Amino acid sequence: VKKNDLFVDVSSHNGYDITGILEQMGTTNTIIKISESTTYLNPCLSAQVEQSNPIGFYHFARFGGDVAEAEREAQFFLDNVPMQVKYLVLDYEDDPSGDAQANTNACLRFMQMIADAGYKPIYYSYKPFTHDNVDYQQILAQFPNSLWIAGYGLNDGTANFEYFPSMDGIRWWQYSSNPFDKNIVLLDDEEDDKPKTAGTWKQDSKGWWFRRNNGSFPYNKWEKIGGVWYYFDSKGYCLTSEWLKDNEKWYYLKDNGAMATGWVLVGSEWYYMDDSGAMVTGWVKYKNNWYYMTNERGNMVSNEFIKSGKGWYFMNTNGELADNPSFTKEPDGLITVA
């Protein structure tokens, strides 16, 4: 998954049929509960898996601060993972021992075993519970950006950045449980490896071109190099700091030729590109601020509204906010948090 992608998490509480909530949510991405303690298994697992695209599975911890118990729970969990997924989640939110360090050590052992089995570990919980029972910084020290924190605020079913859990290393945010657990991704999955490199970059007066291993080079086309997309002109030089409409969609090649994805500042205007690099029109919220963007006839426009208090203020591209809010009732656009 990538920044701002959505996913639903379920357990037996959601039943043997979750097609409905996946339709509502608008995604098939899921993190399904497999086990609890060393003796419980979610009976709806196989059905929920069959009906979705799991990106991970979670375990409800009952080991408190007992490392030995944590190890047995992790193995039970592992022994029941039904298919390969990138992530395995440790849901630590109940039965904490009175000793926060012991709690931390138990959680660390649990996560270490998940990593040893070839998966990416995740620590799931609530901020106040985490604040009172573990030293989350010790967890991030061993497992960077591995947090999945729940914080609903009004819990009205929508993502309201105003109540975003403030903590370091948050990978995913469970922003509501109304009517079902809803989550938004804050960071792209890690890919840290060794870029294949199918050629060598060459720079000169005119710019950068790419000499493929066989001596040829891309031109008049898109081409992924080192995991990044670039568009090369008819002469083989990749475009830089430039808009490009291709197949009825607008893309932006940044100063380094890299295709823009997510939010991107062009000049002094903010635009949002989907994971495919294609520009998104209309209302898109970036954290607390709203943007209405259009590209009618190639005329790129970004209307910015900065939040202040309970209102959103229009900002003329000549950096000047109106004296009064343009709106207090947010539009129903795309909500992004990163």
223 and 337 inside one domain: no
Q: How far apart are the C-alpha atoms of 72 and 81, rounded to whole Å?
A: 15
272, part of any domain: yes
| DSSP-assigned states of every residue in 36-72 | ETTTEE-TTHHHHHHTSEEEEEEEE---TT-HHHHHH
Q: What phi and psi values does residue 157 have, to the nearest 5 degrees?
A: 95, -5
102 and 155 inside one domain: yes
194, part of any domain: no
208 and 87 inside one domain: no
Q: What is the Cα 99 distance to its own chain's centre?
A: 32
Contact 155, 122 (CB under 8 A): no
Q: What range defines the domain where residue 244 resides? A: 199-280
| DSSP-assigned states of every residue in 313-325 | EEEETTTEE-SS-
Domain count, the chain: 3
264 and 285 inside one domain: no
**What own/partner pairs with CB < 8 Å and gap ≥ 24 does 37-46 have?**
37/62, 37/73, 37/76, 38/69, 38/72, 38/73, 38/76, 39/76, 41/80, 42/11, 42/12, 43/12, 44/10, 44/11, 44/12, 44/14, 44/15, 44/16, 45/82, 46/82
112 and 239 inside one domain: no
138 and 120 inside one domain: yes
What residue spans of 82-221 are helical by DSSP H? Answer: 100-116, 127-133, 136-142
**Gaps in the chain (C to N distance exceeding 2.5 A) after:** none
Amino acid at 285: K
Cis (ω within 30 of 0) for the bond into 82?
Answer: no
221 and 255 inside one domain: yes
Q: Is 96 helix (H, G, I), strand (E, B) or coil?
A: coil
34 and 148 inside one domain: yes
97 and 9 inside one domain: yes
Q: How far apart are the C-alpha atoms of 336 and 289, rounded to whole Å?
A: 10
The enclosing domain of 291 has a CATH number of 2.20.120.10
The enclosing domain of 212 has a CATH number of 2.10.270.10
Contact 162, 128 (CB under 8 A): no
2 and 112 inside one domain: yes
Residue indicated by tokens 């990749």? 238
Q: Is 108 helix (H, G, I), strand (E, B) or coil?
A: helix
Residue numbers annotated as active site? 9, 91, 93
Q: Is 5 helix (H, G, I), strand (E, B) or coil?
A: coil
290 and 276 inside one domain: no
192, part of any domain: no
328 and 295 inside one domain: yes
Technique that determined the structure:
X-ray
Residue indicated by tokens 């970004």? 302
Dihedral sign, CA of 20, 24, 29, 35? Answer: negative
